[PDB]
Amino acid sequence: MPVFHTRTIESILEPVAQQISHLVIMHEEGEVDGKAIPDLTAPVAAVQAAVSNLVRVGKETVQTTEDQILKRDMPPAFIKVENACTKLVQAAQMLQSDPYSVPARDYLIDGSRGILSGTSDLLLTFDEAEVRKIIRVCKGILEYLTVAEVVETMEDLVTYTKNLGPGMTKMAKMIDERQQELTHQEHRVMLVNSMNTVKELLPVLISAMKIFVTTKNSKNQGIEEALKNRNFTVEKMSAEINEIIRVLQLTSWDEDAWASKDTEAMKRALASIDSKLNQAKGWLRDPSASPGDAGEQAIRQILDEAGKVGELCAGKERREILGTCKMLGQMTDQVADLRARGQGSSPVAMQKAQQVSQGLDVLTAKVENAARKLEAMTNSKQSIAKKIDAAQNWLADPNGGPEGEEQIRGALAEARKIAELCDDPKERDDILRSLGEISALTSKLADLRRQGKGDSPEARALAKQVATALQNLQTKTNRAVANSRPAKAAVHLEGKIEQAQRWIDNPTVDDRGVGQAAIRGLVAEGHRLANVMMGPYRQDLLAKCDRVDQLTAQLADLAARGEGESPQARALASQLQDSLKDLKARMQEAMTQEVSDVFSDTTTPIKLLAVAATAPPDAPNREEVFDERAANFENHSGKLGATAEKAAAVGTANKSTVEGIQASVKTARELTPQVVSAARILLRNPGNQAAYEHFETMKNQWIDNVEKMTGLVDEAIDTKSLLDASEEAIKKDLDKCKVAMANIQPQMLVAGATSIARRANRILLVAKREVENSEDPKFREAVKAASDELSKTISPMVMDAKAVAGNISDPGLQKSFLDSGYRILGAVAKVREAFQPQEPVNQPILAAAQSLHREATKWSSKGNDIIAAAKRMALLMAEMSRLVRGGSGTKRALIQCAKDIAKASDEVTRLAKEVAKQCTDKRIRTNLLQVCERIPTISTQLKILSTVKATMLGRTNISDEESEQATEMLVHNAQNLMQSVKETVREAEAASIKI
C-alpha cells in the first residue's frame, strides 16, 4: 500500500524508485529475452543502504523512542523490509553465481517488491508517531475547552487567558510547519484555513468569556443568552480540531467525505425545509390573499431544496421525489393560474389547494427516506472499517485454546456481515455474489477452530489467509457503497453542465445515475432563480425550466424503447442543448439582479440594529422594533445567505472560492444567530460598558465576515454583472426620485436618496477590489481616478437632499438635486467602460483518457503547448488504459509511459508556471497556484506506482485482489491526475485571454 503522505516520504521513495526500476528492468530482460545478467552487488548494497540508513535509525526508534504503541507494529515492520533485504542478499549471491539460474532469475522480482512496499511502509511507520505528536496536543486543546467549561470564577479566566498562550503557540509552531509538509493542496488547505479560523476565534472565545464576565453580575446564573454563544464556539473550536485530527490522520486521497458532506447537506436542507414549510403552509392556507410573491418564495424553494434532497438516493426512488415535487408544485401553479386570473377564491378551490397541503407530507417522507437510507449506509461503512481494524485485535493475541479470545472474534465476525446485511437492501447482483464472499469468511470462521484449538504454525498461516480475505472483504464492501449513490452534482457551474452534456450525446452508453441527476440540479436552480423574480418573469422563467423538465421523460423513453442513435432521438435532444444554453444564460444574467437589492446595502441592518442596541432609555417603540430590526437582521441575512448560495451555484470561480463562499455562508449561517443573543444580552444586561463591547467584537466579527463574504461574492460574479444591475437600479431609483418629487412625501425621498449613497460607494468598494487585484495600472488608473468623480458627488447629493428636504415643493432646487444625482450616471457607465475590455480488461482509465481530449479540443491556440501536452499524456493515459492488464512482458513500457506521465505532468506543472508570471491578474494566478500544486505531486507517484505494478505483473504467487488493490490506485490516480489537469488546461487558457 505505497502511500505518498509526507514530503520526505516522496523524496526517499523516488531514490528507491529509480533503483528498483533498473532492478526490475534487469529482471524482465532475463525473462522475456533471457539476457545474460550483469552485476547486482553495487545496486544491491546501494539499495539496502538507503533502506538501512532508515533502519538503524528505526533500530534506535525502537530502542530509544518510547512510543508504547509503536513497539507493537514497528518491530514487525522493519524486520519485513529486512526480510526483503535478505532476499536481495541471496539474489546478488546466486545471480553472480549463475546469471542463467531461472529460480535465481525470479528470486529477484519478489525481493524487489517487499523492499519498496516496506520502504513506503517504514517511512509511514515513522510518521505514525510523528503525526501522533500532534493529536494529544490537540486533545489537550479539546480538554482546554473542557477546562473552559470548568470556569466558574472571575479569578479563573485571567490565567486561563494565560493558558491559551502555551496552548496556541505550540499549536502555531506545529501546524504551520506541517502546512508545508503534506503535498495534497486541497487537503493541505483543510489544515491551515482551519487553523487561522481557529486563530480567529481566540479572543472571540475570550470575549465569550468576557461576555460571560457580564454573567458575573448579580445574575450570576440565569437564562444566559451568551451561554449558547460560548457553547457554539467551543463546539465550533472542537469542530475544527476534530477536522484537523482526520486531515492529519489521512494518508492519501479521501474516500469517505461524500458519506459525510451529504449529511451536513441534509442538515442544511432538512432543518431548512421544515423551517420555510411553516410560511409555505399558511400561505396556501390563505386562498384569496396569497398574491404569489411572498409565500411563493417558500413554496418554490421547499420544492427546489427537496430537489437537492433528490441527489441523495438513486434508482426508482430518485424519480419519485421529482415526481411529487412537480406534482404539488404544478398544483400550486394552477392555483397560481386560478388566483391571478381572478376566480381563485376561498371556498371553491380550498380543497384544490388542500391537495398540496396533504401533498407536502409526501416530501416530509421523501426526505427522511433519503435520510435513513443515507445514514445507515454511512454507519456501516465505518463499522466495517472498525472491525477490520478490530481484526488485528485477535491477531494481537492468537492463543492456543482460550475461552474468550475466540469468543470475541466470533462476535467480531458476526458484525462483518452487517455491512452485507445493509448492502443487501441497496443492491442484489454483486451482493448475492458477495453474500457468498462473507460466507467464504464463515469458512474462514470455520478455520478459526484449528487456532481455536492449540496450534501455532497454522495460526499465522490462516492469519495470512484471512489477511487476503479481509482485504478482499473491505474492498468489496467499498465497491458496494460506490455504485449505490450516483456521481454527485459537481458543485461548480460547468461541472453540472459537464455531468450532463455527455449524457445528452448518448445516454444509452453512459455513466451511472449522474446525467439524469445532473439537470435535476439545473431545474432546481432554474426554479430557484425564478422564485424571487417578477410576475412577467416568474411564470416566464418557470416555463423555460419545464420546457427542459418535459425533455427528461422523453429522453428517459427514447432509449427505454429504441435508443439514442436514431435521428428521431437525436433531433429530440437537438433543441434541448439550445434550451439549456438559454436556461443558464438567462439565470446568471438575472442572478446579478438578485444580488444588487440586498447586498448593496448590507451594513444597513446592523447600524440600525446598533442604534436599536446602543440607546434605549427604556422608552416605548424601542424593544419590539429591536425585535423587528432583528427580524430584519434575520431575513436580510436570510436573503444574503441564500442569495450568495445562488450566486455560489452559478458563479464563475474555482472550487476554493465557491467552497469558501458557502463556508462564509456557513459562518453567515453561524454568526447571524450569534449576533441575535449578543445584541439581546446588551439589552438584558443593560447599558454596561463591560457588556457593551462584545457586540463590537461580534459585529466587527460579523461585518467583516459579511464583508469577506461580500468581497468574495463580489469576487464570485464578474463585476460587469454587478455593475449593470446596480447601474440600472440607480437609473430606476433616480426615476423613483422623480415621482417622489411629484408625490410630495419628503421622508420617502431621503430614504431613497441616501440609498443612492449605499450603492455609490459600493461601486467604489469593488473598484478598490479591482485595484488591489489588477496587475495593469493603465486599466487600474480610472478605477481610482473616475472613482473620485463619485467621491466628489456622493455627498453633494446628500447636501441638496437636505435642501429639498427643507422645501419639497421648491422647483429648480429639486431640479438641481435631480441634476446632482444625474451626473452620477455619467461616470457609473464609465465604470462599465472601464470593465469593458474596450477601454482489454480494466478500462475506467480510458474513461479518464477521453475526458482530457475533449477538454483539449476545448481551446483554440496558435501553438498547442499545453494542448499537445494534455494530448500525448491522455494518449499515454490511453496507453495506460490498455497496458493496465496487458501482457507480462510489457511491464517495461508500464513504467516508461509512467516516466512520461511523470514527465508530461511536470510539463503541465511547468507550463502552468510559465504563464502564471505572464498573467495580468493576481486572483487568477493565486487560483492557478492553488490548482497547479498537485500537477508535479502525483506525477512521480504514478511513476512510482507503475514500478509497484511492474513487480505485481506476471507474479502468479499473490492474492490477485491485492493486485487490483494496486490496480485501483493507478486508475484513481489516473482520475486524480486527469480531472486535475482538465481543470488546469482550461483555466490557464481561461487566464490566457486576459493578455
From Swiss-Prot:
Q: What are the ranges of the sequence repeats?
A: 259-369, 370-479, 480-589
Domain of life per record: Eukaryota
**Which organism does this sequence originate in?**
Homo sapiens (Human)
Please list the tissues where expression of this protein has been recorded.
Metavinculin is muscle-specific.
One of its GO biological process terms is:
regulation of protein localization to adherens junction
Briefly state the protein's biological role. Actin filament (F-actin)-binding protein involved in cell-matrix adhesion and cell-cell adhesion. Regulates cell-surface E-cadherin expression and potentiates mechanosensing by the E-cadherin complex. May also play important roles in cell morphology and locomotion.
Modified residue annotations for N6-acetyllysine = 173, 496
Q: What is its main location?
A: membrane
User: Sorted alphabetically, which keywords does the UniProt record give?
Assistant: Acetylation, Actin-binding, Cardiomyopathy, Cell adhesion, Cell junction, Cell membrane, Cell projection, Cytoplasm, Cytoskeleton, Disease variant, Lipoprotein, Membrane, Palmitate, Phosphoprotein, Repeat
Where Phosphothreonine occurs, the residues are: 604, 672
Q: Which disease is it linked to?
A: Cardiomyopathy, dilated, 1W: A disorder characterized by ventricular dilation and impaired systolic function, resulting in congestive heart failure and arrhythmia. Patients are at risk of premature death.
- List residues modified as Phosphoserine: 97, 260, 272, 275, 288, 290, 346, 434, 574, 579, 600, 721, 795, 809
Gene field: VCL
Listed GO MF terms: actin binding; alpha-catenin binding; beta-catenin binding; cadherin binding; dystroglycan binding; molecular adaptor activity; structural molecule activity; ubiquitin protein ligase binding
Q: What are the boundaries of the region 3 X 112 AA tandem repeats?
A: 259-589
What is the name attached to this protein's record? Vinculin
**Region called Talin-interaction, residue ranges:** 168-208
Among InterPro entries, the record links this protein to: Alpha-catenin/vinculin-like_sf, Vinculin, Vinculin/catenin, Vinculin_CS
Modification after translation: Phosphorylated; on serines, threonines and tyrosines. Acetylated; mainly by myristic acid but also by a small amount of palmitic acid.
Provide the Gene Ontology terms for cellular component.
adherens junction; brush border; cell projection; cell-cell contact zone; cell-cell junction; cell-substrate junction; costamere; cytoplasm
